[model samples]
Target chain A: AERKTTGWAARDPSGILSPYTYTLRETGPEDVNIRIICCGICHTDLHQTKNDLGMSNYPMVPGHEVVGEVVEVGSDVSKFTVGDIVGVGCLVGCCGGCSPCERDLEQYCPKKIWSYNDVYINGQPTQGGFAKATVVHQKFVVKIPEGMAVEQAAPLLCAGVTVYSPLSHFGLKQPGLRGGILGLGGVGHMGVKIAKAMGHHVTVISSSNKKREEALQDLGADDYVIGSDQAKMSELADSLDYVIDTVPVHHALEPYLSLLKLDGKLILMGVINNPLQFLTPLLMLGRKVITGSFIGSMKETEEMLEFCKEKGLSSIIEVVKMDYVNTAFERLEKNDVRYRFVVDVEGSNLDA
Target chain B: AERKTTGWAARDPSGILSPYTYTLRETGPEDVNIRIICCGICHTDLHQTKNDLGMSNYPMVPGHEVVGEVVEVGSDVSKFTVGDIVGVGCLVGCCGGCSPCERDLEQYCPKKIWSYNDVYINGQPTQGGFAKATVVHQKFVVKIPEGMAVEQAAPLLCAGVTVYSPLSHFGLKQPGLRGGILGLGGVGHMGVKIAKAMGHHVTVISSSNKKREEALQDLGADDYVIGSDQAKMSELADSLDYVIDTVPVHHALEPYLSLLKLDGKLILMGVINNPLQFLTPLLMLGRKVITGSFIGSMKETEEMLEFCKEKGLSSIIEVVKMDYVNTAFERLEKNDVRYRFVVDVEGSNLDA
Candidate 1:
């Protein structure tokens, strides 16, 4: 049977979210019904709502870092009970036959469906965690760790895993290696914490010195350097083993590429429409690499949660009710948030 | 006492070669003096002769693919003795305490000294195998495999190992993988042969159809595709496991980057003066890598020689006397050589 729910969605490219009633898909044998608790807002949410990448669908609900509770489980579902806390990330469906899918790395699956702004195999537009409830495949849902706050766990589903995925994939987990986190936004903040927890010497590379104190003191980074500081940048050359580049706009890659040591990697994690530029000699001289990774696999997400829990790591975020999300988007565009802004969905009156 | 020899030197940026006599330093405790048999002409040698990279010093002898017979060994040298065949590649000296040096990856050493057009620790300008003799430390020499012709072993020191090193480093040497060789010049030709010898399905990516027959029939490539044929290019999209890009001029990276499969690598062997451009989404969506590697290390050079001998591999070349070298350079710049031009230094009268 289909279920009705009220969600705040952007009806057009204007990106203004308003209340809309939508019908959830019928619960399938391998599915779980989740009561939306809260969700984390990422830069991607803003991009999708405003049609920045030109692929937006009307009445689209944009949220992926979703934290919720399992209210129902289909007959074939053995992984989730009636009251288990759960999380759903950027993907909800993928073709199960690809090599990446075979290896449980569905993030690289070419036919992956987003939790929002994408259509499912049944020809239904998917809604996100800004709604009161959601239905997702069991393969795309992960259990939130016990005793972890739902608001804090929200960001880990997207922002936290985005940072964790590359570090783990590139073998950057070894202790005492130097790392750089470019840009001081949501993903970059988590990068500092995750790299630090892994015993890396973390250096935050920002455009301005405004976040110097926050990055070094509050985020436990060992060092902070303004990106335009030429002399200081020269001093840090050939030093870093990796840099998790989280800047979501077009920026010069040479400055960061020069900072890496021989065989070092510059891991890019942004979705920009414009092209970025660099000379080939910059990479050729050091045997360096420029690679990109999306949000990690479901297997990695589960492992990331345990790793975060064991390390006693927590994301630094501000919680606000859903009504202020438009204002949050405005602040986020101006780079005003301390790190991430998560929406308190269950506490908001979605049906009013 | 100083030993004298005659070499073909480029006195200025015109890159013309003429005989000039120079003195070699007295043999050190770890030194081996070599009688030059032949040397392979690389594109880099042409660039260095004309001051293309702006660091060229005049009276420069610009050959690095050297194959020779050992004439003498210094008092403390035990690794080589009289009448031993050896090869020396791009690097001759490195700081012994650096990490890359200690790890046998001296290609990454920051203080590394090139075989020619570079200053050694003794402040003497190092000349290359365009001459009749060279004096090198024992640490930089590798034994030429027995039964290998000196002329056949010349290009293996530089071009052959240049293609082999990255495949070995990136773990792309696995059999049954699909590989693309861009540009059918000397290095690209070697890339096809080496990747083919490793049991890969090799595809030659050419800007024009000029080298299609040579690449397929002569080099044992499995497929051929013109780079600008959109229909054919689209047919090859997301199909290759790796592409060894050997085009040394400015070119768009997007077209080649699209040919890679998930987790695929685009290994660049080019040295371009200007910047290359690409959008971030191209990389982010597929988790692909763009990396560069220089010439192989001495240890790898030895291993590569053994591998080529065991595989019965030989570089396609037109052997020339030293006097026709200027014409060879002119032809090489125009892409007119069959593959590589090996200079027979032993057969030429350098003193005349």
Candidate 2:
């Protein structure tokens, strides 16, 4: 049987959202139907819906940080059942036989598939979790940990795993080592908490002192340094063993490059749009490195969830009705929310 | 007993050469006296002589690629005796207690003393192998390979070691991998031979196709890619495991960055005085790396020499008398030399 639902979607690049209808085809043997409770709004969601990145497909339903309940499952889907809590992130599918996918790094695979506004294997355009319900393969879903609220855990599907994957991959979890986070937004905040939970000392580097207390006290960061403060910057120069740059802009990277000790790695996780000018001598001074990554792979995302469970980690989120998305986006753009904004899909039907 | 000698040196930044007198103090317990035979002209030699790099001391006698015969030795110096062929490159002294020196990476130690234009343990500016005779610590000297001529081995001290160190450091000698050498001059030519001898596929990337046959037939390069040729450039995209750039000028690095496979390194062996611009996405595409290195450590220099000896390697050189240095420099500036230009220090009577 097919399932129908109401979803918010952009019909074109006019930046206007309207009520839209979506239908899930009959569940395949490897598929599961999810009753979405909440979905976190990512900056990329806006970029896609508005065609800001110039790659959006029409009538796009853009949300990937989905947290919900499994309302239905096929005979081959053993991972979840009715009312089982679950979540899904940005990536939805990939060519399973490719080397990167085989190594469990599907995000780097050539044929990677995204959750929304993406062409599916069946030649259908896949809609995202902005809808009241969604159907996806069992391989793409993760089981939400017990004791975690659906709304708060929604953002962890994207923001938490994005930062946690690189942190875990680069061995930043080692005790007593200093790890620097170069932004104070969603991913940067999460990076601080996760790195701190993993026994590494965390330092938040922001352009201003606005988020210092929240970074130090709320996110468990051991220190805060203003990026514009030369004195503080100089004091911490060559201090960090690893630095995760989450800023979504192209700025002078030479200053940040100076903060790395010998053999340290500066992982660029955000801001892929602009060119950068870097001094080779700075890298030579300490044998430092600069690298990039997309979202985490499915295996690494599951590991991230398990680690979050063990560490009792949860994203701070505010739940709002789906009709309030435009308002939420405004606040998100201004960074006015505490950390993340998760839309309540059940409450969306009232506006419809 | 004190030893007196005459050497060509720069008294100031005026670029004029004059005869300078030097006295060698009594040999230390581990010191040896070397009768100078040949010295290679290096770009750094010009830099220090003109104070271009701003670290040159006055009355600088600049030469590091010193090939000679041992004339005397201290009682404690067991490595060589009178009449033994030996050589010294760059470093002549260092604090024995520094961690890097202890690890034999004397090139990086702050306390490591250069052969010329640098302060030694006695707090006096050290002279170089441009002189007729030099006394140095035996630990800073290496025995010239029996099969290698003194003139041919001179440039190996600086140019050979510069490329060889990075090759060994990055593990490029591993069999069956592809290596790219950018720029067809001094270091690039040597890099071609070394990488080829190490069992890797070598390709020379030059600004023009004029060096193609020379790179292929003379230096044993497997192939030559004209960097200025658009079709050839496009064909080599994502092709190399490693690229050693020897172009000592600042230019757009995007083309080279595109040639790297996933996790491939582009080692910048050349030092550019101008600023550099590159897109972060270029590095993001393959998780590519750009790094630089100075000259090799004394220990690595000896290791390179031994490797060259075992492989029966010899550098192409145009030997000239010391009086012909002005002509050599003019030709060097115009890239007129076949490969390296070596000065015959023994043939020049500086006392004239």
Candidate 3:
């Protein structure tokens, strides 16, 4: 712990954001010092800031979808240089010898430490990307594509990679396969963008017709259906190859599970603690799958950036300054953002 | 209905076994008439006799694992001829135009008819292989391979195909894949044999050590573990490629689901009606699958017979005469059989 980095931290359960300063660990060998440029407000951040998940640390800087510039690199780092643009997501460190880590899927490593509200190797509480700067293990950071906008790159680290890993892993990336995206928030909006880029027939399903236009016209989803529209749901029954369940809250699974055809998958992107209920016959009948994925790997994060750059996929983010982060959190809680809110950390006055 | 047949049936929910007379459907152009040779008594037969599944018919003739000698064939019956030994399993008819049928998965057709406890289109109570003779639509009949013991082939019709369908469909047919078989009854026992034939490392997971000797030495299982043995279960955690569940009763699923590695499947063969509970995290964390399959497709049934014949796979059975059917059912209810009970119809007097 050798550096002072300024960030907006929630000191208590009230989750009201304010300027605060904390010590970040000095750049060690195999570490990179990133000067935070912009960070995306993800639903997980909302959950962490308000202690909704019951494990929030005090003075938590809650951000994982972080975009930054590499201001310094440790002597042992070979993957990055000073002044290079980079990003960091939900994980900072993992047990390097575990099976998941051996396969480059550190996201599933059981002992992996979270980017925030988690303690690191030296026993210091880990901070997040909402701060002006962060020191991360070099392996956990990914390179930003050359042509991608900095704010657009922020959300892709978490939301974008969350969707990409499943598509790539579940063999749902082939052209012309039918796909469903449930919920239209940060991670969900990227679900449409990434799935559409994979050349699939993307259908956005929601609790209501609230985000139909934005999902259909703006997001270029081929179809939109209100999840409660029984007629349309029945019509589309057993029709999709996979559904990216981005809904963060607990809800009945049968609705989305019914949409997948034989051998289809329902990938849960939400870290919901609620015990979900389902009839065994529902999954057994057509051999549908209900599984979830954590954020994603640093390997996938790099590939997702490349894929997004190649497909010209851009997240629909509304950029705001640090002064507005608290209001953004409130709006995000109500699902009021168009897609995601990116806090422009570089432009905010941290000493105020 | 044009012919008379005699078989032992349950007249009520007492589940008591007795001889009865029933009419058989006339041999249609697509039908084959078979003189019963032997039929395997399955646990499902016990369920139907006691109205356990709630759809039992009065005087229900409950048998589906049927082996017979074709005595007559209609003009258009090209798949079989007189003097041919054949088998019929859990399905009698299905909507030929349904998507599942179109894919040759007739067992999954929504309008599919059970082999017994069901009414034919002509309103005759469909009798089962416990009868002296029967007529069936040729579409659901499978050929017993030449030189295959008809009694051994009987259990394969239901139990064999039940295990084979999931293994083939879930891609567990490849050599060296690790597989788990839960429950040591008819289907579970067959799961071990079939998986062993597929060149898999077969592990029999049960509730006790009762079947360890037979599973390891007799059935040629590579390993056996009591599911409740935490140390053993943990030792094998993230180890299996798939597990075929044949417990035939509602039980907790987490025990077996945790044994799977990434992308592993838990194939449910039991027709459990009870609601099953599981944390979404269990399935999502490793992308494990919980799915069920009906007996099998007629295509898969034919394929399974050929595969079994090639692999020299034979079912362990206790051959009993027709008079012992009732005692056999009683014993089966108490889990008293080594594996399966096959009734010798041709050798017993149904006329009594």
Candidate 4:
């Protein structure tokens, strides 16, 4: 049976969200049908809505950090049942036989399906959680832990996991280590919180002193260093075990690269349109690494959720109804949000 | 007593070599005096002789891959006795209090003294092993294993350890892994052999077919692929566990970066003057690393020597006399040697 729903969709490159009606296919054997409650606004949503990456189709609904209430489960789906809280991230499908998929790293799979702006295996358009409902493969859906707030779980599906995966994969999860979170955005904010929860001495590195108070007092960071401050830069040089870089522009990497100690890591998180450059000595001299990680594996996503719940970690977010998403995107572009924004989809009158 | 020795020296930026005499510092309690037997020619010698890096001094005697016999040992030097076979590489001294020094990674110590073209802690000019004799700090010396050919051990000091350090450091010494060597010079040749000896499936990735036979038939590589061949390139894509990139000049790294599988490493081993560029997606999607390693630590150097001895691994080389040192430098710049050139300092008359 066809399931009809109403949601906000971007009709053109203007990235403006307005009411649109859509239909979802029947829940398959390995699927879970969910009623979307809230969704987080990601930098990627803005990219896809405005065709910034040149891969968008008309009437596209853009959202991946989806938190919802499970409405029904397919006959073979045992991970979720009615009234259970759940979430869906940026990926929905992957070629199971690929090496990455076989290793549970489906995010690196060549045939991974995006939650939106892409087509499904059956040639049906894969819509996202901006809509009222979604039918996701049980493998891609995670259960939000009991007592965890639904709005708080939204950003964890994407932004939180992006930082957690690298720290987990690179063996940086050990406590009492030193860390640097460069660029205090949605992901960088979570980087500070998660790293602090893991018992690291966290330092927020920024280009200016604008976010010092928020990064230190509000986020509980141990230190804040202005990128241009030579004295502080040299003082902290060759001291950190890892630095999570979240700035999405062509910036000088040498300054940060020098901040790493021996065998340290500079984990890149940005997707810049232009090329990034660095000399080889920065890496060779100290045997340091310049590496990166994608969003995360489904396993890591689940582990991240449990870790967040166990540590009593929650994202700093401003909740708004669907009507404010356009303005949210503008503010996000201007770096005006405290950290992240979540759209209260069910509370908004989608059919207005 | 003052100890004087004759060696080949570069007088100016012309990089031409001629006979010159210099006096060695009196052997301290922590030093060993060596009778120069032979020394290996390295690309760094060419760089220094030509003033390519603009850090050269006139009358600089440039050589580091020094193999010799201990003619004398200071009272505190228990590691070497008179007539004991010994060797010294790029470094002769390091500040003993630094972290790298404390960890036995003296090569990375900031105050490390070069074997040549630099001044010692006492402001006296230091000379290298292109000469009849050298006196070095005991900490910088290594013992050449018994039954190993003296000529073969010469390149191991610089070229061999340069390849061995990263493999040993990155936890890539395990057997049965797949590896790629991106150049076919002195360091790269040893990379193929050392990686092969480590029981890895070695692939020589070259820009053209010129080194196919040499890399395969001569070096015993499991495979050879011309980097420009897209069909072969794609066939080997997502296959390599590591790539030891030894290309000194500027080249496209994307080709080698793509050959790596998930969690793969592209170990850079160059000192190019210009900046290298790459897209972030290439690294982020796969959790790959672009890192480098300096020459092996003294501890690793000892371990590598034992491994080479146990594996019966030796470098391919062309041995020449000290009289032909200038001509050897000429041929080396043209990439004319089979693999490496070791000068017989003891066989030729140093004063002639």
lDDT per residue for candidate 3 within B70-187, as digits (tens), equals: 9889879998989999998988888899778898888877788778888776677777888888898999888899978998888889888888988898778899999998887777
Per-residue lDDT of model 1, residues B70-106, tens digit only = 8988889988878999988998899988888898889
Residue pairs in candidate 2 whose N, alpha carbon or C atoms collide under 3 angstroms: none
Q: Candidate 4 residues A9-83, lDDT tens each?
A: 998999898888888878888888999999999889988999988879979888899999889888899878789
Q: Give the per-residue lDDT digits (tens) of candidate 2, residues B228-328.
A: 88897888887788888888789778888888776678878777766577677656556566766667877788788888989878777999888887677
Q: How do the residues A1-352 of candidate 2 rate in per-residue lDDT, one tens digit apiece?
A: 3857778888887656777887666778988889898899978887887788887888888889998889899879987877899998887778889656677777776787789888878777888899888888887898887877788678788888778777776667677878889987778888887888888888889887778778977787888888889998998877788888888788788888888765578888776586776787766555567776666777877788888878888677788898899888777777778778889887866333
Going through the candidates in the order shown, the clash numbers are 0, 0, 2, 0
Give fnat for candidates 1, 2 and onward, in order.
0.93, 0.47, 0.52, 0.86
Where is model 2 chain B poorest over a 10-residue stretch in terms of lDDT? B280-289
lDDT of 3 by residue, A281-308 (tens): 7666776676777678888899999999
Q: List the residue pairs that clash in candidate 3.
A: A284-B292, A292-B284
Query: Candidate 1, what DockQ?
Result: 0.81
TM-score of 2: 0.88
Q: After superposition, how far is residue B189 of candidate 3 from its true place, in Å?
A: 1.8
lDDT of model 1 at residue A230? 89
Better of 2 and 3 by TM-score: 3
Q: What RMSD, rounded to one decimal, does every model reach?
A: 2.0, 3.6, 3.0, 2.2
TM-score of 3: 0.91
TM-score: the better of candidates 1 and 3: 1
lDDT of 2 at A85: 92
